[PDB]
Amino acid sequence: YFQFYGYLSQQQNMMQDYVRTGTYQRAILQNHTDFKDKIVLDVGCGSGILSFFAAQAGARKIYAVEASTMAQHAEVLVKSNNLTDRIVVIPGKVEEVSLPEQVDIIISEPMGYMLFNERMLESYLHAKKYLKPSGNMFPTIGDVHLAPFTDEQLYMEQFTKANFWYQPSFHGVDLSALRGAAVDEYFRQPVVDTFDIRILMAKSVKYTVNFLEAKEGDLHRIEIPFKFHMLHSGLVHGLAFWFDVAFIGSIMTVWLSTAPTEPLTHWYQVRCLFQSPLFAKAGDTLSGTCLLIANKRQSYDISIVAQVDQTGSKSSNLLDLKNPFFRY
């Protein structure tokens, strides 16, 4: 996490998501009266682009904190765009460094897959110790959406991928006894890619984090109960996840959405299969709990439990977000 982020090729890959770059620039500059003559903290600034957007909006002073060697590249951009007076790059972790001054506004891009992955939100919330009571954060809130999906093609792919392990004589070795463990491992990988909304079987449930109010420790254990009103009849193969963040400015509220009804981002969307699918009729209710537990690997364990109330038919899975399947 503090070596992968030191690569310009990584910063270049992320800056080429036009929705990400354009949405941040629009959020900041449409709300430019919220930056004019203010003090700004940029948390995990990377190449420094958000610090430049703050400068474009007339900020007085911007502290740009970056834990990786990307910080050295940022101080090169600040010197070459003639801004050393106004943008101060501070190499180090936002938890350990010193700021000479409290700030009017914190800006960051801390969203991983499914919003929480990489656990950079913990660092964004930690930075609030530097924020005046007056103060705002950009982004301001995050909504995670969950909905059940039906996708027999994706379900069956997990069996197909393991059918290597069926071989009773792979060079004289019987592999067959491991086929079930292989299936099982594939099912524990969250699937990162996009899909058509035609697969959703119910309207999404929304879980909101208010970054103005939430505290670092809220994200160690995230509990998301759901009740879906099934709009279609068939097999539910798992839950689909996406997120939206809102930049709530004085002038305007700007949304960055990773929803499958919006243009593609490099966040795609994430699907977690159940170990075995549930039959539900239109009219039935599908209820359960999604639990995200933060792990030492800077990711989450995802526990999902769902039952159809009308039948009592129940399914679950425990997925490792450290190990996604990038199907796109």
Place this chain on the structure above:
Amino acid sequence: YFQFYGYLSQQQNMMQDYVRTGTYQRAILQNHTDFKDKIVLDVGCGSGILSFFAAQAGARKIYAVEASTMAQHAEVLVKSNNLTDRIVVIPGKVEEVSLPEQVDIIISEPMGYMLFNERMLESYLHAKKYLKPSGNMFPTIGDVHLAPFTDEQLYMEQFTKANFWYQPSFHGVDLSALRGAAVDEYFRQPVVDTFDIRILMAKSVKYTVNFLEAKEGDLHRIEIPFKFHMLHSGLVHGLAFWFDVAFIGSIMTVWLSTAPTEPLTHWYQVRCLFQSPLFAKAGDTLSGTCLLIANKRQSYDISIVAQVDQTGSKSSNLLDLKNPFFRY
């Protein structure tokens, strides 16, 4: 390294390289008199396949040591192929575990990209403390080959990939001052893929490690001097690397080659660009040194220095094998 190797999907990907699996089975079974009634150590056994090949050749007892959770999957295959008496799976690092007995023969697949990557050879050599003076190792020796190449398409690609950083106004930001650092980072990535032998400008130099004699500490610092006799006139853009291992049995010597004149393996071949190319005439000599320094990340820093003796024109690079470009 002790989590990535715990995945069946990784074991499955490696077992599907037909040259790798077929070559190991042929080496062991053509030399079956070297295993018949013997004691065998399988170092980093993975799924356990080499332990089964030892059993196929009549070994008496095989200790199969594996540091990852793949060990639990191996004990499932041993029980299901009816071999618990003959193959003993030992979960843990070959450096820390106990064997009740010295062995006639050590078998392993410890070769990373460019042979040394992942530094598993250090563990293979460490295991020799368990080997009788009688004893053999499979594989027995490794040859690394280096040769100079000419590939203007690959050279120019490194500039093209960085031309994102030329933008004087990326959303009002001048990126141009970082273009040189970006070029530079691309040039420090070893290129993993295959190429036509038509690009080689001289016959390869061979550096041999004799695993029977070499000691763990020989691989901390590997020094490979070279003198090439240029067979073609043009720009030399860098050095190409590949390796061969030999299974030197009583009955036969079997070769596993990753050479560009042999069928493709999932080792491909590796090319390191010079920061700037050297002009050489057919008849000139290209001399220098390739130095591999082992790092904390279980990989190597690659320093390359070359000059054309006839002109004194000199080039270098320092590459990080932890960060390859997978161009295939």
